[PDB]
Amino acid sequence: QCQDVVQDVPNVDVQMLELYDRMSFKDIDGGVWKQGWNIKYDPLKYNAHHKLKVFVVPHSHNDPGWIQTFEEYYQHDTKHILSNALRHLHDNPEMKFIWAEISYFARFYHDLGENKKLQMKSIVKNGQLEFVTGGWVMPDEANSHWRNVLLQLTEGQTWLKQFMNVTPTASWAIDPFGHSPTMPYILQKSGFKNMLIQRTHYSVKKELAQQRQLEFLWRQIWDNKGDTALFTHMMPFYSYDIPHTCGPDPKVCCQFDFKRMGSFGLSCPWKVPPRTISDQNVAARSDLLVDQWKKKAELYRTNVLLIPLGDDFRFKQNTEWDVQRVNYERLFEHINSQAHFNVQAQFGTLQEYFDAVHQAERAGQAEFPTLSGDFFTYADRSDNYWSGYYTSRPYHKRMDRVLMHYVRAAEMLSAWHSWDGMARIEERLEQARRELSLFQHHDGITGTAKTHVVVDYEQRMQEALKACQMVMQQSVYRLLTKPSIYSPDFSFSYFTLDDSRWPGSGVEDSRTTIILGEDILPSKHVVMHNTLPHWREQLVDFYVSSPFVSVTDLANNPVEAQVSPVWSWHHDTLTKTIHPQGSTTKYRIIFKARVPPMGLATYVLTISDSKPEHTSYASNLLLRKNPTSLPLGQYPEDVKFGDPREISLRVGNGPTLAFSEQGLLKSIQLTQDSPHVPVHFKFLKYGVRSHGDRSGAYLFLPNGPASPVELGQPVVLVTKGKLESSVSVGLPSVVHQTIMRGGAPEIRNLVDIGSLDNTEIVMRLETHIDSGDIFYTDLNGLQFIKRRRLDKLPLQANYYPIPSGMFIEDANTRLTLLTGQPLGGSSLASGELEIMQDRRLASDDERGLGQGVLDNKPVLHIYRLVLEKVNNCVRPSKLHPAGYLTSAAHKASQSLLDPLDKFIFAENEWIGAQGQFGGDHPSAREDLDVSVMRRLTKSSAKTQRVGYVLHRTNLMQCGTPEEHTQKLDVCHLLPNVARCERTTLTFLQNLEHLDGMVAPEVCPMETAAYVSSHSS
Ligand SMILES: CC(C)(C)c1ccc(C(=O)C[C@H]2CC[C@@H](O)[C@@H]3[C@H](O)[C@H](O)CN23)cc1
Ligand SMILES: *[C@@H]1O[C@H](CO)[C@@H](O)[C@H](O)[C@H]1NC(C)=O
Ligand SMILES: [Zn+2]
């Protein structure tokens, strides 16, 4: 049945880790093709019976924000490009154009008058204007979570199906900074047949070009059979611009960019301008151009050649459409009429190219190689590796993951019911999906936009978060109120969300205190939501106005709780120390919530005059020389003081952690009898070069290995409780916290790089683990890929995206660091892991941004740190390119990305309150997730439809007996099911009508989508 993703090493023609191991990466001057060689061809290769078919594909690369905001670019550029495309294509039936970014197209189309909408539909229907990919954006592939890549793809394609009646099956990704196999994974499961990529390391382009392996069947690294394969075309040259798309010599190709003759303010840096094509020069101009084409064709296996014709925000003015079209028409008429060239050239679309390639393949003229792996870390030239943007603007990288989860929770919570249009549910969800989707752009989440554009993305995401909160809290109120009592005001806040980790303590004072008192309000209901499809327990905390608070479930059963102080860290500009202050009127109450699969659970917080039976109080110990008092109001335990010293902590039966006198982890002891394993946290700094190329938003160009941050004698705070303990230390630029709840610790860093120009702050772990040169990092939160550190490459080349986790291991021991935000990282020596926290760069790095990164703001980064024995685990063989998490590490990642949601009832009394929702939902096996639950129909539809995306990961077998769990059939989650269909991941095409209306569970590493239809 299911493929084995662990024990069968796929046999592929090109495996990128193996290729990397072999390649020398020499950066030699190749001639006019600076990073290649002087291409030679046999003029006799093409003849009357075997012609070269050339497709010139006009395009315009439109960024949804970069140097201008989305709306600024729309007003200044994109609306004119689309208006003039409509006119020019209408009037010139053989002209063609491709379009990628549906965020822009949807904005444009909705503003068109009906006559023009109809004209637009006609040029799409007739194949002149073709959508490529059809996502809301052209996303980053490094930092983006797969769930959000799918979200934005679905947003654009759903719009295209509704308004344009088309669904692209070819993808175009010319600008993201390196490429991920997560893209073909999602695309192939969304109906695609072909994809195109561009930004891959120049040494990779050279190597693959030499072997004619630039077109390949790209399969996943674990896929033995090849069912995940997607045909992929990699472009061969340095850029997608016209100089780098006609052939290997940009001095020649630039002369065929007819916008560069002067009047448009553009020119050719190779110092030979374009000249207007005429009868007196067409033969000569054609001989130069066809020669470039035939050289390019040498790099590929068929007689069908792709020639993109475009650049950033091109095809804006009428005069530009004319100058490109008329000159190319003259070239085509000459070339096609002169038999000696043996060429047939025309304007075409991307799909037309791929269709012709596969026709050639089926005619037996070519066979294509198979490939697995990724295309990180990209370098466009010399030692300029683009690993900086794995970290740039980390506040917004963290915000991405928070909004990811809020969109999921809002769509899921509201899916259970049909809503009246007056509730504005669909409206708020569309807004939230679109703002999160926009941020997936390769200048959004990447942190590579101008300051004011970053602010625009942030404002949009803030509005999206508020939209999600509104939908979530309306849904909770409906799900947990007696039906005959429920009386909604769709504008009212029945609950407010409480989020302990966003924006975070020390970032924003955003959380509401639950105010209780004998003379105001004795008690408060709170509700937790669990978006995961299994029963889950998690500690939750709330701020309360008294320490004398106890917790009950709605059956009035006492729940054990812990109260701790509210501690805030302050950079004391008088004493020049960083030290914690405690509140004398707010306290934290902490208790274990237990919540059904995809469900809700209600608890009550009640005040009393004195210490409640079932609530304990943490001790607090402040370690510093020169302490001063720390009063805590009614908090019943006095703060203790001491000189800095090593300390050890253990919560529950979990690990025992030892810390240095500077408050940093030094060892983990898994069990009572077991060893104290060395695991040391350290903070270091990278700088910037004083000569040569400077680091900026894209590039990481360190001035050598990192240097330790000088710590001084930092203040350390130890809080010890029955349920939760922690060690926090105020370091320069980082308040570092290790939190213990009885399992793997949680690490939080409040990172404020302040005014430290030209500094990158890294967090490193040093261990004994004999990892050598191997480490593992994830791709888009979907899969873990084996990395090999290569000393033949510079330090920055060995940095990779850490979108959600990384690990090192030897025969016996593994250390895994899971993240709540994408950041850059590496393992630069055996036994180490490191991950960048923030970077502040004074200089521009010459990729068009025109500024450094000087807009840093405090960010709360979150992690889980999992030390495990793996000697008993069934792991892939030494040649397998993948790795897999254990159950504990996977659950730890879920605790970061999809925590319980917390709701505080706003009013004094909740009439008709219920204790639970979802107690009857199946508790699915731990490796299965309902990644998406989305109602697809509005309330007017007689047949309601609900869509589910189901993802099964693969966890290592390590000898923990499996306990029986329940089968999850998503098609029966809502009553009155009438049909169940397997669909593409975007929900746009029905693939299978399912027997018995039962949606089968998926195989390890597979993702499927199902839609259930309901008659009532
Ligand atoms: C002229 C010079 C300053 C030397 C320059 C060099 C390279 C680039 C890009 O690669 C820009 C690429 C690559 C980086 C990316 O941020 C941008 C935008 O998305 C836009 O679509 C083009 N993208 C730009 C300028
Ligand atoms: C939409 O596309 C399909 C496939 O070509 C076609 O059968 C259908 O009639 C089109 N719908 C409209 C309204 O043109
Ligand atoms: Zn771009």
PDB file of C-alpha atoms in Angstrom, residues 60 65 109 119 124 150 238 365-366 457 656 690 742 783 852 904 986 1007:
ATOM      1  CA  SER A  60       6.213  41.417 -16.728  1.00  0.00           C
ATOM      2  CA  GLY A  65       5.452  45.249  -2.550  1.00  0.00           C
ATOM      3  CA  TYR A 109     -10.292  43.097 -12.807  1.00  0.00           C
ATOM      4  CA  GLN A 119     -12.826  41.746 -23.377  1.00  0.00           C
ATOM      5  CA  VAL A 124      -7.850  34.604 -21.685  1.00  0.00           C
ATOM      6  CA  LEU A 150      -0.917  26.274  -0.212  1.00  0.00           C
ATOM      7  CA  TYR A 238      22.171  34.813 -14.417  1.00  0.00           C
ATOM      8  CA  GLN A 365      13.318  12.702 -29.397  1.00  0.00           C
ATOM      9  CA  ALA A 366      14.285  13.098 -25.714  1.00  0.00           C
ATOM     10  CA  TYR A 457       2.756  44.349   5.480  1.00  0.00           C
ATOM     11  CA  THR A 656      17.062  17.745  35.144  1.00  0.00           C
ATOM     12  CA  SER A 690      35.586  46.459   6.243  1.00  0.00           C
ATOM     13  CA  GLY A 742       8.108  18.458  32.767  1.00  0.00           C
ATOM     14  CA  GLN A 783      10.165  17.606   5.563  1.00  0.00           C
ATOM     15  CA  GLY A 852      20.424  48.581   4.982  1.00  0.00           C
ATOM     16  CA  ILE A 904     -11.502  35.233  28.237  1.00  0.00           C
ATOM     17  CA  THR A 986      -6.941  23.765  -3.653  1.00  0.00           C
ATOM     18  CA  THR A1007      -1.176  15.225   1.921  1.00  0.00           C
TER      19      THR A1007
END
